[PDB]
Amino acid sequence: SFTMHGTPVVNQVKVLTESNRISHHKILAIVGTAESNSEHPLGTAITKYCKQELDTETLGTCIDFQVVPGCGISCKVTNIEGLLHKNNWNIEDNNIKNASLVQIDASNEQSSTSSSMIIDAQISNALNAQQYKVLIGNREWMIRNGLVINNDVNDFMTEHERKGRTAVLVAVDDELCGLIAIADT
Numbered sequence: 199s200f201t202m203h204g205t206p207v208v209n210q211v212k213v214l215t216e217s218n219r220i221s222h223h224k225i226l227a228i229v230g231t232a233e234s235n236s237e238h239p240l241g242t243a244i245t246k247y248c249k250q251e252l253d254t255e256t257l258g259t260c261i262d263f264q265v266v267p268g269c270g271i272s273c274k275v276t277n278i279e280g281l282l283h284k285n286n287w288n289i290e291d292n293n294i295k296n297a298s299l300v301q302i303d304a305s306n307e308q309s310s311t312s313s314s315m316i317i318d319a320q321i322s323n324a325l326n327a328q329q330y331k332v333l334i335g336n337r338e339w340m341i342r343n344g345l346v347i348n349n350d351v352n353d354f355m356t357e358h359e360r361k362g363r364t365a366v367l368v369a370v371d372d373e374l375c376g377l378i379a380i381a382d383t
């Protein structure tokens with residue numbers, strides 16, 4: 199029992215990774231299938247925009263998220279080979295080894311070390327259980343994810359904010375894929 203009355207509606211989309219990685223139709227598919235499995239108030243407008251395009255309802259498979267209030271969210275979304283089912287426990291930290299392993303005799307010989315247990319155990323899991331790193335929202339995480347922002351998308355962005363609407367970006371596997379304009383209903 200809580201509020202959800204300030205409803206958002208998706209109003210314009212533009213692409214940035216054109217010809218290089220992902221196209222507009224796969225962009226709206228991966229955002230709409232991610233928000234089909236999330237619990238957010240805003241990105242679910244793209245869930246409908248996708249569901250109404252696909253004419254199917256049966257969209258969204260497993261997600262491994264990291265969420266923030268106001269600043270957007272990040273996750274790993276599968277469907278392409280999700281038939282393995284992943285181990286996801288604390289995995290953004292879950293370390294193979296907090297020590298040397300490329301050439302120990304040249305770099306800090308503390309120990310004997312493990313060389314197969316836990317090492318590769320998460321990488322070979324993901325490389326068979328094929329998956330996709332995606333994030334969406336705000337503007338500061340769009341900076342912090344190692345990306346570059348251009349003066350034309352910024353002139354397009356602040357303009358929707360000047361018009362008093364909701365103005366956000368979408369990133370994928372350390373690339374910028376595109377941007378979204380949204381309004382209130």
Ligand SMILES: Nc1ncnc2c1ncn2[C@@H]1O[C@H](COP(=O)(O)OP(=O)(O)OP(=O)(O)O)[C@@H](O)[C@H]1O
Nearest residue numbers: 204238239240241242268269270271334335336366
């Ligand atoms: N699924 C989501 N994906 C990305 N960003 C999201 C998501 N849900 C919310 N946001 C972020 O929320 C920000 C807007 O915050 P705002 O305070 O307007 O929302 P709200 O908290 O729902 O509003 P209200 O003040 O009515 O509670 C956007 O810039 C957007 O990035």
